[PDB]
RNA sequence: AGUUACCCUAGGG
RNA sequence: UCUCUUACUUUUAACCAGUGAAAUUGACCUGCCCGUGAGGCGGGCAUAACACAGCAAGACGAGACCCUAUGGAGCUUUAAUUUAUUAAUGCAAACACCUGCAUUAAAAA
RNA sequence: CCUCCGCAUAAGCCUGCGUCAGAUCACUGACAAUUAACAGCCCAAUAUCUACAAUCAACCAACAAGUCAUUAUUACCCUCACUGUCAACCCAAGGCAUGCUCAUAAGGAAAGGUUAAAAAAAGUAAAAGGAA
RNA sequence: GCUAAACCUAGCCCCAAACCCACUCCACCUUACUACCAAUAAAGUAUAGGCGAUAGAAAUUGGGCGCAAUAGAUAUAGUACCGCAAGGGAAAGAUGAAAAAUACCAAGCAUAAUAUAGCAAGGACUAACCCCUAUACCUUCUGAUGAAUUAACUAGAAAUAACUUUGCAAGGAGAGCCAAAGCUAAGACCCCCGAAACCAGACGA
């Protein structure tokens, strides 16, 4: 993908993306504050209170996070209102559409104090790290079966060690338990 | 922009760096020395000032190499210190003349001479100042080992140096054999140009030879990993032993 | 196996072996009409004609009878948005004739919406003898 | 494609065994051999005056009777060093460049926030 | 038009044959030609 | 020192 | 060919439809006679506005020739002086080749 | 109704009127294809042999004097790999090597519609005279 | 109201600092990308020179009053394209927090063709025209040249002396230099485009 490709709502690859960003786009690149990996503290499924714009004050939960951008979508909160399936002849159906939102308009609620807190990530004996209220001293954890095929290795069979360490080559390992025999001598060749 | 250092000082800033900087330290020094060739082809004033005839005062006076020209037939050779002296003339002597191009030659001479240290005929291009020096060094043997590498400006002279100055530091004895005599008087001659034999390797290596030399020095197979393996274990089961 | 340097042969040397091939292969439809015993392939540029029968022999327990190949020169007659030229890729085509008398013949492989639909039925599509008015009002 | 998925994970799989296997001969090879290569090669200098890395190839007779071999150049000429000089103040521009650009885009950075 | 004679004249093997051509290629390869020689 | 119908360039009539 | 041109056909052309350049262009509300120095000035005269097709009298549009430059280039020589050289000689050096110093020519500046 | 063109190979070019879909006197995206017997791609050494043209090659007929070949000894046992193969095409804005057909069995279309002015171009016919 | 206009930021420039690059596998000198065979000062002083145009020592001393898409790199790229080759060498983009929300201004025209007469205006006028007055401009001659039009770009660079204004004053000046009111500091003077040639090294014929 091109520099300062613009990040938006749509996946980078799809086809509202490559309608919106051409190959051939350059437009002016959208200053981002520098956030370190280990500094991001919102992630999907956190419940989160929103302080600026309309639904101020209203708590909602992180559905996605375009990193990329430092934002954050919640879920049924920052709405306006759009059309879908806008055919010929029909208007279609109005939806409520949600807008990003910077990480600067949103903060993070305690599970028992409901309030939005600053957080530190502090390191724990139990866990490495993990993060920390400011306004009390208590965790906030991070949020959020199966059938095997025809063509998927059971765990009792994929976890077996068959592996004997040896020093022979795979060919040499292969050639002597195939009972393929060479009795011909490799006649050593030149190399330069 | 600039770089840090100045172009001319790349040459010196590269011996400092790699294989350069792993060679002997005396073949280092060697290439550092800029000492100046003895003058040939030019007459030095006789004293650093002199007192001029025009204006009657005194200024410091300093002689200019003229440039010689050094053909590579000349390192095969043993010329002087003398070359070709490619220049220009006016036409007769006269500054209202044209500029007009002249090459000075030297007179060469296949001569035939005999190193004694080395034992052997050896077929030589010289000049007549060749023999002089010859003749004023007592020997070729004496004119080798005493004359310095920019007097000499020779490739073979430096093989011939080498050559001598191994076989005095090696004590060889294949210079005479069932001959004891007469090699430790010829070995005695010359016991003043004695040199260490690590020193009389290096010594007349162009830079690029000096390289390839200590390059083969380095070489060595890589040491497989398991006997450094079973080394460390051993070692692991002495210290397990005596604690 | 593809990539990689092949061991130099000398009079009276090993077999070369390759435990682990590295090209891999498909088997497409035919664009025109074939005999009944041929089977087509897409290959790879190194790989030559006895790879791909001791390879479909070995691998496939495939009883092969006659290979063919050819290069297929991709399209180079086509440009970005800087008028630079974009090379379809090169390719090998393999025709296997199969032994033993038998037959392939390629196999027909491929033989949120509930409210959009919910709504689609219930367009009530403007009256006509309305004339613009709105029919949301019950006066 | 009906799940295209699976593609990438068979890649990724053989990806994985290769790496493993890799991993097991290189190991050996240090073992037995100490060389950290399987391909025997050098750092030979080309025409053109580049530091590059021959990778030998398998021949029949020696290297000093290969008409063909010896027709290539392993050493640069007097009249390329000049042309290294060039390059390399090239890629001193480039790099300067580079490094100034980053210094001006963390200007912009801070003086937005 | 010929291809034996265009790689013939301003072909690699031309080029490097020479100190002249391979100065040119040194030329073509600081100016970042895509194209260094036929 | 001659010469240019091979003359050439900037201008002028 | 001409006295001496005529008829026909095709192309072109004119009109209808589609597509659609270029040189050119100070601005123009762009007349005639005479005079001065001519659509534009002076004196007379004329004079509603508006296409399309024509014509080619005027408006508007290369190829030469001479001179100049304290501007070039080439060619020929018995311009300048020189022989860097190349061919010869003469003399030094060395025990003929190679070198240094002078002279004579061709080809040269 | 034209055919002085055509069909193959070479050279050159490089997917450049195949299918599906779309936009644009009235190209883009996707998919598909050229399958070797033709043609490229050759040759184990060491010596040692290679005077008498072609032209129906027989006379004739000559000068410019010619386009062609093996033997001895030694070594030798594995075999059908790789590559070109498409088109309405190239070079310039008319030219093009070779073979085959010498009007075709192959290949094409001079008229966008009308009118029937001038001038212009080409063609045909022209009394009497026939270079004025 | 069409055509259009507008936009900031990609990047770049000059410094500082610091001495840079170069083996995933594979292929590449044969027709490349082809597995495999015979500081400052001394000082513009001494000096050199058709002693002239000019040339000229030494001893000695010690981040931004930057550009912001015709700019700034040629650079969106040494790409497209041109050339057999060496080689030459471009143009251009702009919404917003979200696209998982689709007005006003160049020339040229249109709305809206024209009416005796004439550098197209000026004086006027109740009144557009009618009346009166009015030889386009620039350059070069003493008094033919160029230009369709719009937008952008596009052309005076040197402080010796002197002068003015300060400082200090027989001294001035933060070494060196000058001084018979001088010395120190400042200010203020010297454009753009446009040959044939010659030389060097390549590339083709």
New binding site residues.
């Given amino acids: 993908l091109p ?2 490709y ?1 990040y ?3 996946p980078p690859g799809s086809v ?1 993306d490559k ?2 960003n051409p190959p051939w ?6 200053v981002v504050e520098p956030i370190s990996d280990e500094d991001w503290y919102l992630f999907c499924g956190d419940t989160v209170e929103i302080l600026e714009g309309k639904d101020a004050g209203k708590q909602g939960k992180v559905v996605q996070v375009i990193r990329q951008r430092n934002w954050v979508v919640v879920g049924g909160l920052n709405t ?1 209102y ?2 879908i399936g806008k055919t010929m002849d029909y208007r279609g159906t109005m939806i409520p ?4 939102l910077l990480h600067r308009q949103v903060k993070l609620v305690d599970p028992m104090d409901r309030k939005p807190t600053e957080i530190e990530w502090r390191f724990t004996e139990a866990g490495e790290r993990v993060r920390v209220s400011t306004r009390s001293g208590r965790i906030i954890p991070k949020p959020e079966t199966w059938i095997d095929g025809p063509k998927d290795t059971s765990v009792e069979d994929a976890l077996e060690r068959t592996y004997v360490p040896c020093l022979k080559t795979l060919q040499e390992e292969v050639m002597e338990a195939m009972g393929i025999k060479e009795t011909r001598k490799y006649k050593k060749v030149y190399w330069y | ?5 100045p172009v001319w000082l ?1 040459k010196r ?2 011996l400092r ?1 790699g294989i350069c900087s792993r060679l002997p330290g005396h073949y280092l020094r060697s290439l550092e020395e800029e000492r100046t060739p003895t003058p040939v082809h030019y007459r030095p004033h006789g004293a650093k000032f002199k007192i001029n005839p ?2 009657g005062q005194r ?2 006076v300093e002689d200019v190499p003229i440039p010689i020209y050094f053909p590579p037939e000349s390192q095969r050779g043993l010329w002087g210190g003398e070359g070709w002296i490619l220049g220009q003339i006016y ?2 002597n006269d ?1 209202l ?2 500029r ?9 001479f296949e001569r035939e001479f005999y190193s004694e240290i080395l034992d052997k005929k050896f077929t030589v291009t010289v000049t ?1 100042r060749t023999l002089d020096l010859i003749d004023e060094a007592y020997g070729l043997d004496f004119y080798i080992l005493k004359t310095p590498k920019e007097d000499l400006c020779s490739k073979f002279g430096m093989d011939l140096k080498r050559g001598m100055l191994l076989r005095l530091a090696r004590q060889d004895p294949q210079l005479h054999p069932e001959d004891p005599e007469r090699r430790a008087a010829i070995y005695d001659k010359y016991k003043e140009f004695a040199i260490p034999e690590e020193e009389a390797e290096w010594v007349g290596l162009t830079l690029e030879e000096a390289i390839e030399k200590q390059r083969l020095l380095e070489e060595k197979d890589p040491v497989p990993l398991f006997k450094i393996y079973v080394a460390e274990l051993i070692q692991q089961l002495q210290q397990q032993a005596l604690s | 196996a593809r ?4 061991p ?2 000398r009079l009276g040397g090993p077999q070369l072996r390759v435990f682990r091939t590295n090209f891999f292969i498909q088997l ?5 009409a ?1 005999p009944e015993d041929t089977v ?1 392939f897409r290959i790879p ?1 190194e790989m ?3 790879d791909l029968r001791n390879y479909l022999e070995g691998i496939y327990n495939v009883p092969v009878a006659a290979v ?12 970005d948005h ?3 030229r974009i090379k379809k890729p090169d390719y090998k ?1 393999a ?1 296997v004739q199969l032994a033993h008398g038998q037959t392939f013949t390629f196999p027909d492989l491929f033989p949120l919406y509930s409210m959009l639909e919910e709504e689609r039925q219930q367009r009530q599509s403007s009256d006509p003898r309305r004339g613009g008015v709105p029919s949301w009002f019950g006066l | 494609m009906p799940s295209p998925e699976r593609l990438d994970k068979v890649v990724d799989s053989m990806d994985a065994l290769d790496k493993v296997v890799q991993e097991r001969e290189d190991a050996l090879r240090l073992l037995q051999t100490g060389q950290e ?1 399987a ?1 025997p ?1 050098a750092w030979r200098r ?2 053109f005056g ?4 021959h ?1 030998f ?5 020696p290297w000093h ?4 071999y010896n ?4 050493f640069a000429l007097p009249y390329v060093d000049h042309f290294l000089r060039l390059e ?1 103040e090239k ?1 001193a ?1 480039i ?3 580079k ?3 980053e ?2 885009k963390a200007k ?1 950075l801070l003086k937005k926030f | ?4 004679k ?9 080029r ?1 044959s ?1 100190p ?2 391979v ?2 290629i040194l ?2 390869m600081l ?8």
């Fill in positions: 520099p300062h613009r938006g709502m749509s509202a309608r919106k786009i350059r437009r002016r690149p959208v306006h759009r059309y559409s949600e807008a990003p | 922009p600039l770089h840090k250092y790349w800033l590269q760096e025009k204006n200024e410091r036409a007769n500054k003349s044209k007009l191009k002249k090459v000075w030659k030297p007179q060469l007549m | 990539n990689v340097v092949y130099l042969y497409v439809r035919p664009g025109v074939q087509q540029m030559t004609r006895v063919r190949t050819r290069v297929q020169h991709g399209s180079n007659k086509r440009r800087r008028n630079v085509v025709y | 290569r391909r090669g080309d025409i580049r530091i590059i890395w990778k190839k398998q021949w029949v007779i009777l290969n008409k063909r027709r290539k150049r392993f390399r890629r521009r790099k300067a460049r490094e100034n650009l210094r001006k912009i | 038009p010929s291809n034996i265009r790689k013939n004249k301003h072909g690699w093997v031309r490097l020479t002249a051509g100065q040119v030329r073509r100016k970042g030609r895509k194209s260094l020689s036929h």
